[PDB]
Amino acid sequence: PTTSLVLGKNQTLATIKAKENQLSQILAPNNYYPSKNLAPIALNAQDDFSS
Amino acid sequence: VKKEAAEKLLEKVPSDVLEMYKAIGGKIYIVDGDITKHISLEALSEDKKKIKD
Numbered sequence: 010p011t012t013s014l015v016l017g018k019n020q021t022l023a024t025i026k027a028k029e030n031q032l033s034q035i036l037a038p039n040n041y042y043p044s045k046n047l048a049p050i051a052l053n054a055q056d057d058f059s060s
Numbered sequence: 061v062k063k064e065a066a067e068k069l070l071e072k073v074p075s076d077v078l079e080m081y082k083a084i085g086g087k088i089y090i091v092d093g094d095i096t097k098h099i100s101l102e103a104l105s106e107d108k109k110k111i112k113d
Contacts, residue, residue, distance in 0.1 A: 056097065058099075060095060060096070060097065
């Protein structure tokens with residue numbers, strides 16, 4: 010996914026494309042990535058090598 | 061006779077001026093790691109190169 014962090018009304022902080030740490034191989038319908046018992050994933054990077 | 065009294069001539073101490081210069085402060089600058097990215101294929105290649113008749 011390509012997502013966007015936004016403050017306020019429309020003050021966009023950042024626009025981030027999901028990196029290889031954030032890849033989901035399968036997303037079958039009526040499902041979550043990751044599964045609901047597990048904890049959600051962490052997005053904290055800007056670069057393609059996420060440095 | 062009349063006593064000297066002695067109130068002294070010396071005032072304070074150098075130690076405050078000594079402490080002023082004694083200032084060390086912050087030194088040195090950031091170097092080495094910086095950021096570091098890098099990506100290209102100048103290291104090794106891959107292309108069909110066989111021999112025949």
